[PDB]
Amino acid sequence: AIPAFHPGELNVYSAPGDVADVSRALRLTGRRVMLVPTMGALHEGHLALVRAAKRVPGSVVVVSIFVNPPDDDLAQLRAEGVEIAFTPTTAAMYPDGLRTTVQPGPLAAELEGGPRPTHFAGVLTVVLKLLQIVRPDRVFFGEKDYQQLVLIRQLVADFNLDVAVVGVPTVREADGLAMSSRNRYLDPAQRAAAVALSAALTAAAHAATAGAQAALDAARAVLDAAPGVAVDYLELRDIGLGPMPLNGSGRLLVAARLGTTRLLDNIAIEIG
Amino acid sequence: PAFHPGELNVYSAPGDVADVSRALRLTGRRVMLVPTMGALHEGHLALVRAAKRVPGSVVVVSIFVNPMQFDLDAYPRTPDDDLAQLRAEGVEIAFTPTTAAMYPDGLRTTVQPGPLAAELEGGPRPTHFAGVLTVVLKLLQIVRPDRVFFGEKDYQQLVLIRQLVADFNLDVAVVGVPTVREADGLAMSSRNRYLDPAQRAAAVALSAALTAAAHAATAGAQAALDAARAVLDAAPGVAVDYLELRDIGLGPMPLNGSGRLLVAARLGTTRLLDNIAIEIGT
Ligand SMILES: O=C(O)[C@@H]1COc2ccccc2O1
Ligand SMILES: O=C(O)[C@H]1COc2ccccc2O1
């Protein structure tokens, strides 16, 4: 006997099997279930994911809130017109501890996998779990976390998952700083120098008419002009994060440490 | 793709069985999946029949020698026979993927099983269960059945498959089906064809040892194990890999009153497995 669901209101479920039941019962009456996976502490970047999910005809929006090991977040979802939030406990998600998990391909070891070499296994495992619980038609991820998005596409292809993965463009502050809840930790100096990540990336995107080396040199010059910005990497790759082709579409990714804060950004790049 | 019902439809492309599967489900048929590596025998057909017996069932049997779990060139391949067997059971769908369609990106994203996959069958073959759980996950995602059928012969495999299913929240019921035996007790296996008449006769020691142990078990664990050990020792050219008494989920839990007894042994070059349910004492 299917759990209670009230149209046009924010229905909150904590039990995987509840949200599973409602979702499956909703698809059968012709709603198209959209999944927005989040870790709570919602900002505009999350809201953009929600909005893209809402403009699918017949969409009902599922937003998970789960910290991979509050009333505010729900008021934001309530205010965005979201019908389902899925807010499970660590024990509901992992009732048997860390047992079977997803092992990512070699990409999970590069770039962000450098300092956090198990991070994406964690991410892929929970994403796979969420996809099985909710069974969405479409799943929404921000391009901010670009490597993560490429790995999730890989998970979906690799395990024959029958879901569309949708990548939503990065939401930025007025000066271009990619939104993140870490941005709140930057002191004034750091916050001003932080602009250089997106300025370098945009500078590169336009320098690219002159070829790849010009793009990289433009990005580097800009980063070089900022104080207190320790670049962990600055790399140009193809859109799937393999080696950059001689010309054609690419992606430029950067990561840096400002004090104790690690910021990331990336951007689409055409070569030529 | 076409579906001529009451007939056996063979699809090789993942896409074609996914589409046909979904369509059949959207019309109310209950999709049953029986994954196999072909070279089918009566132990497979009992898996098929359990599936047929579920009402509104449409039966998918998958046949795929998975290069990730492997030795690989030595596996028995008998498709004409396999296919005529399924016609004869009135199986409506055979799913026979190519390696390229299953591994277009080689080994990229794979399943990592729990610590149970390092033990028993997995001790000298630490990657074996990874390949099994990877292809099983993919097959469940392609075919999307209500239920999935496995023999208890490969009991460790069965237990890890239920780990797969619980840990990743798969919305599928796993059905364990009791081991089919030759009239002398020998567990049916595609591997059995590799025993000469001598080894075939010795091979009965495995089920004899287990059934002995199951009845000796009123006298306790040690008696059951000694009973099995005695039978195996009296068998000519049976070399025991392991003989182990475990809890039924095989795991970090102590054996209570209920268990499973597991044996692996070499006859010549052929490895056999068998297992049985043990009740200890009362
Ligand atoms: O043919 C068989 O016995 C095995 C039984 O176990 C299998 C597990 C996954 C995929 C195929 C399988 O085939
Ligand atoms: O809060 C977030 O930004 C997101 C970012 O990506 C996520 C992926 C999987 C589960 C939760 C996630 O939360």
From Swiss-Prot, chain B:
Disruption phenotype: Simultaneous disruption of panD and panC gives a mutant unable to grow in the absence of panothenate. The double mutant has a highly attenuated disease response in BALB/c and SCID mice; immunocompromised BALB/c SCID mice survive on average 36 weeks as opposed to 5 weeks for mice infected with wild-type bacteria, while immunocompetent BALB/c mice survive indefinitely. In wild-type mice bacteria grow for 3 weeks then undergo a steady decline, bacteria persist over 8 months in SCID mice.
UniProt-recorded name of the protein: Pantothenate synthetase
Gene that produces this protein: panC
One Pfam family named in its UniProt record: Pantoate_ligase
Binding site for (R)-pantoate: 69, 157
Class of this enzyme: ligase
Family: Belongs to the pantothenate synthetase family.
Catalytic activity reported: (R)-pantoate + beta-alanine + ATP = (R)-pantothenate + AMP + diphosphate + H(+)
Domain of life according to the entry: Bacteria
Note: The reaction proceeds by a bi uni uni bi ping pong mechanism. Was identified as a high-confidence drug target.
Phenotypic consequence of residue 66 to A: More than 1000-fold reduction in activity and 50-fold decrease in adenylate formation
Residue positions binding ATP: 37-44, 151-154, 180, 188-191
Function: Catalyzes the condensation of pantoate with beta-alanine in an ATP-dependent reaction via a pantoyl-adenylate intermediate.
